[PDB]
């Protein structure tokens, strides 16, 4: 089917995203509940990212995993581009983290497990996400973590704050699948602490701290969590833990559900 906007009943705004807003939507024939992100053609052309969006649709057409948000397809009119997306009823992990300030070890390890599984699937079909962050993680009906937004994704090897990016990427160097592993380490830190490890008021300071791998743990972080994060956040990408090593880490096994 060739989708048009007239096929959908538009609901309430679900959030404000990269190049436009995400709305709740219902397909008129089947009454199916979904999400539509509305992007503008001018904004996509001016950024020179139209090929990246075409790649995302392509990449998402092949990917099938319960911990990955579905992109069903897209369509456009005169001015706007519409992404047909799976609805995530429990919102962003970003919103959940603001609500709870920080997650307990049980919730964190469960998310990391789910993340790792999703990434393990992506890396086997050789896809790197490159944009792992709380705002690109959503929660399904049963509170399961779902990864979204493959706009910055590439095949290995090869917008916002610098917080989740590894030293190789910020320095404009060569990078592979191990970037998602660094971002997972940043995630795990932020989930438990409430803020990312290299957080700063300035871009330049954040750049300094990532380059040096300059970060400390607060007193309440356990040694098990400290171990995982330290072994994920290593300047040398080849020295970082693999996803299987993460899923088999003592602290993950002990706290994950």
Ligand X SMILES: Nc1ncnc(NCCc2cnc(NC(=O)Nc3cccc(C(F)(F)F)c3)s2)c1Br
CB of 123 to ligand X, least distance (A): 19
| 7 is a catalytic site residue | no
Site residues for ligand X, window 156-185 (CB under 6 A)?
Answer: none
Select from 197, 204, 127 the least CA-distant residue to 164: 197
Vertex 237: Cα angle to 248 and 68 (nearest 5): 55
Q: Which of 25, 49, 193, 232 binds ligand X (CB under 6 A)?
A: 49
From the CA atom positions of the chain, what is the Rg in Å? 19
C-alpha span between 257 and 243 (Å, rounded)? 17
Which stretches of 125-166 are DSSP H helices? none
Site residues for ligand X, window 70-89 (CB under 6 A)?
Answer: 83, 85, 87-88
Number of residues counted as binding ligand X (CB under 6 A): 25
159 burial type by CB count under 10 A (0-12 exposed, 13-18 middle, 19+ buried): exposed
Confirm or reject binding of residue 149 to ligand X (CB under 6 A).
yes
Measuring CA to CA, how many Å separate 132 from each of 45, 56, 212, 239? 24, 15, 21, 20
Confirm or reject binding of residue 151 to ligand X (CB under 6 A).
yes
Confirm or reject binding of residue 35 to ligand X (CB under 6 A).
yes
CB of 134 to ligand X, least distance (A): 12
Q: Which of 8, 25, 84, 92 binds ligand X (CB under 6 A)?
A: 92
> Nearest 10 degrees: CA dihedral of 80, 81, 87, 92?
-80
The catalytic residue among 9, 77, 104, 131 is 131
Residue 234 known to bind ligand: no
Contact 21, 37 (CB under 8 A): yes
For ligand X, which residue has the nearest CB? 151
Q: Which of 138, 145, 184, 246 binds ligand X (CB under 6 A)?
A: 138
Confirm or reject binding of residue 120 to ligand X (CB under 6 A).
no
Q: Point out which residues bind ligand X (CB under 6 A).
A: 14-15, 17-19, 22, 35, 37, 39, 44, 49, 52-53, 56, 69, 83, 85, 87-88, 91-92, 138, 148-149, 151
Active site residues: 131
């Amino acid at each position: 089917r060739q989708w048009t906007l007239e096929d959908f009943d538009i609901g309430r705004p679900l959030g404000k995203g990269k190049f436009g807003n995400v709305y709740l939507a219902r397909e008129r024939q089947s009454k199916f509940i979904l999400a539509l992100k509305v992007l503008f053609k001018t904004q996509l052309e001016k950024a020179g990212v139209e090929h990246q969006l075409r790649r995302e649709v392509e990449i998402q057409s092949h990917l099938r995993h319960p911990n990955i948000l579905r992109l069903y397809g897209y369509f456009h009119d005169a001015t706007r581009v519409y992404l047909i997306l799976e609805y995530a009823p429990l919102g962003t992990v970003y919103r959940e983290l603001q609500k709870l300030s920080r997650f307990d070890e049980q919730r964190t390890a469960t998310y990391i497990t789910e993340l790792a599984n999703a990434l393990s699937y992506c890396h086997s079909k050789r896809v790197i996400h490159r944009d792992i962050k709380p705002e690109n993680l959503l929660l399904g009906s049963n509170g399961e973590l779902k990864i979204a937004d493959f706009g910055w994704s590439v095949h290995a090897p090869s917008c916002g704050t610098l917080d989740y990016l590894p030293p190789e990427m910020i320095e404009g160097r060569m990078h592979d699948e191990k970037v998602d592993l660094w971002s997972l380490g940043v995630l795990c830190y932020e989930f438990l602490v409430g803020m990312p490890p290299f957080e700063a008021h300035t871009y330049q300071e954040t750049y300094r701290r990532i380059s040096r791998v300059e970060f400390t743990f607060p007193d309440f972080v356990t040694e098990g969590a400290r171990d995982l994060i330290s072994r994920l956040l290593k300047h040398n990408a080849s020295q970082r833990l693999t996803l299987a090593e993460v899923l088999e880490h003592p602290w993950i096994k002990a706290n994950s559900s």
